Symmetry: C2
C-alpha cells in the first residue's frame, strides 16, 4: 500500500463542504438543495457540517476564482477539527486549481476526501500527496436526493467511512436512476423514478484477480494526462482500473481513443483488471462494450478481467471506491470485492 | 534548432508512399484514386514513385497489422534511394505503431516525410528521432484531387520541399473546399465545388512574435499525451503552436478541454503565438473561437497572438508546416510567415 488511509468518522465529527468544481451550491435557486444535503449529513449520519469560506459564493465567483477554491481545500485540510471533506458537486474546470495547491498541506493532514466526476482532479491532488481518497457521493447529487437518500448509498457510506472492518463484497444495487428532475425547491417532494438494475456483466476474463484501485471519471482523467498531476508509474503496477463515464455521454469512439492511449502509456498492460460504471441513462451501454473489447483485442489483452455495469459513476445509487485499496474481480462468480477497510 | 532539416527534393527523385493509418489506398474501389495521385507526383513534380511493400494490401490487412505498417516506414527510411515519403491518407489508429518503430533508423536517414491528421502520430515518430517533418498534403486527399491539383497546394509543395530559399509569407488561398465527392471512379471528372475564402482572422494579440512550429491535428495529439511519444520539454519553449481540427468535427467543448490541458501542462504559457486551421466545412467556426478565447481568458493569456482560419488542416487547399521551423505572427498586418526554408 502506497497511500495513507485516513481515520473513520463517527457521529459528532465535523465535515467540511467544498466547491472545487462548479460553484452552483451557493446560487440562490440551488441553496435549498445544498441545505437539504447538509440536513442528511446531520440527521442521518449524525455529523456536524461546516462550509468552507468561499464555497457558497455562487457559480460566477467560483468560476472566476480557482485560487479561492484551492484555498478552501487547503483550509479544510489544515483544520485539525475537520475529519472529512465532501465535494458539493462536480463540474469541468477544477484542473485550474493546480497552480494553487500545496501538496504538503494535504500530506501532513490525512483525512477523508470524497466526491466524483470532475472531482477526479481533486482526488489526484490527494493521490499526489500520498493520501487515499474516496470516489463516491457528493452533497447535491447524493446526500440531497429528494424525499430520502437511497438506502444503498447510505449502507455504502457506513461500510466505507464509519467502519474499520473489511469492506468485502460489493453487491449490485436493486434499482438505479439518472432521471432529470430539476433542482427547483417546489420539486423537493417528488421522488425520482427508479429502474430495475440487473447486476454486473463480465465482458471478458476467466480468472480471479486482485489489485489496488486507481482511476476515476474517464473523461476527466484525460484533463490530467501529460501533467504533473498524473500518478507516477508505481501506482499503475498490478492495478484494478476503475472507469466511469459522465453526464455528457461521451461518444463511443472517444472511449476507444482514450483506452488506446492507456495502452500506449503501458497502463493496460500493467492492469490486473478493469471495472466500469453504469453509463448515465445507460446511453451507449452496448456500444461502449464493443469499443472496450476491440481495444483489448488490438493490444493482446483478451484475457484481462473486465467487469461492467457497476453502481459507481454518473447514476444513483453509488458505492465508494477508496483509491489504492486492494480489490478483487472474481470472473467465475461475476463478483467485485474490496479486500480491506476504507478507513482506520 | 533540435531537428534535422532534410535535403531538398527535385525532379527525378524517388518518393515512397506509405499507409501508416487507414489502409484504403489498396482497396479495389479506391485504387484508381491512389493511381491518380501517383500520376500527379510523376507528371507535375517529375518524381518516381514507389509504394512500400505492405502499403497497398488493403484496409483489412493494414488495420490488423500495425507492425507491417511500421516496417513500411522503416523500409522507406533505410533505403537511401528514397528522398521523400508521403502518406496516402490519415485514419485513427497509427498510435498502435509505437512499439514497433525503430527511432534510430529514422535518425540515421533524415529525409522528407509528409502528411496530416492521424499522420500527426507519424510526425511525432520523426520528431522524437530528431527529424523535422512536414504537416502537409497526402496522396489520396491532395495529390489525387479530381481534374487537377489546386495551384495553391502545388505552390506550397514547391516552395517548401523543392527550394532551399526562405519560405516567407504564407498568403491565404483564394478559395477552399471540403465537399464530399466519393472516391468512386465514375466521379473522376467531376471538380469539387469551391467556396470563396475570406482570409485570416486575428482573434487576439497586438504584437509581432516569432517562434518554432509545433502542433498538428488537435484530436490526434491527445492520443500521444502522457506517452513516451510526447515531445520533451525543450520543444515547447518559445513555440508557435499550430492546431487543426479533423473531419469528425469535434464538439466545441472538447477544444476547450484540450486547451485547458495544454495550460495544465505549461504549454500555453510558453507559447509565443498560436495558429488554427479552417475547420472542416467551417463547422463550429464561431463556436471554436468562443472556446479558444475563453480558455485564454481563464489563464490570463489574452495578449497571446492567435490567428484563425488558415489554410492548413481538414480542408483543401493546403500550405505546409515544417516542424520546428521558425515562424512569425504579425498581428498589426494579420500575417503569417515561415522565416526559414523547409529543406536544405
Amino acid at each position: 500500500a502506497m497511500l495513507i488511509k485516513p481515520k473513520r468518522l463517527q457521529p459528532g465529527d465535523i465535515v467540511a463542504t467544498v466547491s472545487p468544481s462548479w460553484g452552483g451550491a451557493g446560487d440562490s435557486e440551488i441553496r435549498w438543495r445544498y441545505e437539504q444535503g447538509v440536513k442528511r449529513l446531520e440527521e442521518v449520519f449524525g455529523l456536524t457540517v461546516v462550509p468552507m469560506p468561499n464555497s457558497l459564493k455562487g457559480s460566477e465567483f467560483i468560476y472566476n476564482n480557482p485560487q479561492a477554491r484551492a484555498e478552501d481545500l487547503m483550509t479544510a485540510f489544515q483544520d485539525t477539527r475537520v475529519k472529512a471533506i465532501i465535494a458539493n458537486i462536480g463540474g469541468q474546470d477544477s484542473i485550474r486549481l493546480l497552480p494553487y495547491i500545496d501538496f504538503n498541506a494535504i500530506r501532513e493532514n490525512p483525512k477523508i476526501f470524497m466526491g466524483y466526476a470532475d472531482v477526479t482532479i481533486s482526488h489526484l491532488f490527494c493521490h499526489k500527496a500520498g493520501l487515499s481518497s474516496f470516489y463516491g457521493p457528493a452533497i447535491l447529487t447524493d446526500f440531497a436526493e429528494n424525499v430520502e437518500m437511497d438506502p444503498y448509498t447510505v449502507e455504502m457510506v457506513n461500510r466505507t467511512l464509519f467502519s474499520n472492518e473489511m469492506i468485502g463484497e460489493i453487491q449490485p444495487a436493486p434499482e438505479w436512476t439518472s432521471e432529470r428532475l430539476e433542482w427547483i425547491e417546489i420539486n423537493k417532494d417528488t421522488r425520482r423514478t427508479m429502474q430495475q438494475n440487473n447486476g454486473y456483466e463480465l465482458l471478458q476474463g476467466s480468472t480471479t484477480v486482485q489489485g489496488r484501485l486507481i482511476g476515476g471519471c474517464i473523461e476527466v482523467l484525460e484533463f490530467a494526462k501529460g501533467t504533473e498531476l498524473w500518478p507516477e508509474k508505481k501506482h499503475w503496477e498490478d492495478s484494478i482500473l476503475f472507469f466511469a463515464t459522465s453526464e455528457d455521454h461521451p461518444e463511443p469512439s472517444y472511449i476507444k481513443y482514450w483506452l488506446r492511449n492507456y495502452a500506449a502509456q503501458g497502463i493496460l498492460q500493467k492492469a490486473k483488471g478493469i471495472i466500469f460504471g453504469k453509463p448515465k441513462d445507460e446511453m451507449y451501454y452496448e456500444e461502449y462494450k464493443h469499443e472496450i473489447l476491440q481495444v483489448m483485442k488490438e493490444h493482446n489483452l483478451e484475457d484481462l478481467p473486465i467487469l461492467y455495469n457497476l453502481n459507481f459513476g454518473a447514476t444513483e445509487p453509488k458505492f465508494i471506491l477508496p483509491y489504492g485499496s486492494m480489490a478483487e474481480i472474481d470472473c467465475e462468480n461475476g463478483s467485485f470485492s474490496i479486500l480491506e477497510s476504507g478507513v482506520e
